[PDB]
Write a protein that binds this ligand. Structure first.
Ligand SMILES: COc1c(O)cc(O)c2c1O[C@H](c1ccccc1)CC2=O
Ligand SMILES: COc1c(O)cc(O)c2c1O[C@H](c1ccccc1)CC2=O
Ligand SMILES: N[C@@H](CCC(=O)N[C@@H](CS)C(=O)NCC(=O)O)C(=O)O
Ligand SMILES: N[C@@H](CCC(=O)N[C@@H](CS)C(=O)NCC(=O)O)C(=O)O
Ligand SMILES: [Ca+2]
Lengths: 241, 241
């Protein structure tokens, strides 16, 4: 019964994770957009002292999101939110019930967070070399069930954790967004269209086909425009190695 | 009934996390040391293709750990293992039952992984300035309940995840092990003994006082000697400014 408010921003793949899980849960929830990178509201540290999107409040009296209550629980970190939503909505089966299959979900999230995410950040924001990103993506693809299906077989929060990033990669590459070189952009576009990455392309299509993605995605062009508002995506800057 | 084999190394805080959780669960399990950093066995990629410790096998026929079975489940990534052990031993209450308290546990793990561990890596392996690490530790300390207790109140896997690192910090600093200068070593030692960090000292005492720590710790001096075998800690080497 307790209220859920998710503080969001369209560009943010971390916020996108949580919107997907809340859709899959069938939750009733409120979203509130926050201009976190250019004009953070003075009240925002009340909902997340770390000053990062997403932020979540849970319970407390029903209040406008820009008037957060001291009584609501303040939940930070997107992966913690994903597990929280699975705990709140057990009948939605956002995780498997078998312990080994649940571990596949948790391992997939850790592989992404520990080996892939930092490579996306460094290639796009620092223009570091793309080969280590492609290697990490090939590793992650190797963890998928080979024949089809999601990270743990049935859909789970592991797929909510990963699709925001994989789904942004393709249109960001096509629009030329990111500080990497022309040469590395060509390399990544050819690699991600190559037979080497057929399995992860099917994974992206399968995740994108679900209503939880369609209803939380602004469209490729619109997401590209939101990403262009991010200060660390400095237009006209590229790094070369 | 299904066997658990943890591939371990004394120096490894990541392996230590999982030993602590297995002890708290009252599990039956085997540990098998692996010289992962200097002489990895040719069979080790069969249990973990990432070639990292810890690695875990689950189920399958009982076999010597250096002859792993293709029938066992191969589980990678320490935090996935911690969640797996909680799933396997629900009567051990390795997580809270209440969703909000469980979220405090997951959030504390994510704060450590996302903001603290990388600062430990920078300071100890690169000798970068200590101030950002102390700031990250103050943030993590601020997430603890101020009046006492563990991360989520009662002990949970969140405390298994974090104590291996905090417990190594003090004796490593006493030994001067790591690429930071004497000047920053003194600065860290003074800071961690100061009133600023009284709450995290209480936390380290409370975690270390549990049998799960005593039974999985070689002793301060012995743990320092194991850490000196780690190539990336470059015993005898320090960077300055
Ligand atoms: C501002 O957008 C973000 C963000 O808020 C947080 C991030 O870590 C990233 C990011 O854009 C880049 C990107 C590349 C490819 C796929 C998804 C995202 C790099 C990245 O890693
Ligand atoms: C070699 O041991 C390891 C390791 O296997 C993985 C690590 O991330 C670290 C580490 O030693 C350093 C260290 C500092 C303070 C406390 C625990 C550990 C830095 C660190 O971050
Ligand atoms: N690990 C966090 C990361 C959240 C994050 O970095 N959010 C960015 C927007 S995509 C932000 O809000 N602020 C950037 C900053 O100040 O660190 C999570 O998983 O929720
Ligand atoms: N995220 C992994 C980290 C595991 C890890 O990095 N282990 C180190 C020992 S502490 C290793 O075995 N190898 C480091 C390397 O591959 O060079 C976990 O949580 O289990
Ligand atoms: Ca595979």
């Amino acid at each position: 019964t307790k209220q859920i408010t998710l503080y969001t921003a369209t560009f943010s793949p971390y916020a996108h994770r949580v919107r997907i899980a809340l859709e899959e849960a069938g939750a009733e929830y409120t979203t509130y957009d926050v201009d976190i990178l250019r004009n953070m509201p003075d009240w925002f540290p009340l909902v997340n002292p770390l000053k990062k999107i997403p932020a979540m409040t849970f319970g407390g009296p029903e209040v406008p999101p820009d008037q957060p209550s001291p009584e609501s629980a303040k939940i930070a970190e997107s992966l913690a939110m994903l597990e929280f939503i699975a705990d709140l909505f057990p009948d939605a089966k956002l995780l498997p019930t078998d312990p080994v299959l649940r571990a596949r979900a948790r391992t997939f999230m850790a592989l992404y967070e520990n080996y892939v995410n930092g490579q996306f950040r460094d290639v796009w924001f620092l223009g570091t070399p793309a080969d280590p990103l492609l290697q990490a993506l090939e590793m992650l693809q190797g963890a998928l069930p080979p024949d089809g299906g999601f990270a743990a077989g049935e859909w789970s929060i592991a797929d909510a954790a990963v699709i925001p990033f994989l789904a942004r990669m393709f249109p960001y590459l096509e629009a030329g967004l990111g500080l990497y070189s022309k040469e590395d952009g060509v390399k990544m576009r050819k690699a991600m269209a190559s037979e080497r990455f057929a399995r992860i392309r099917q994974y992206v299509r399968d995740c994108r086909a679900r209503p939880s993605f369609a209803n939380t995605w602004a469209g490729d062009a619109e997401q590209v425009e939101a990403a262009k508002t991010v200060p660390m995506l400095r237009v006209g800057e590229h790094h070369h190695h």
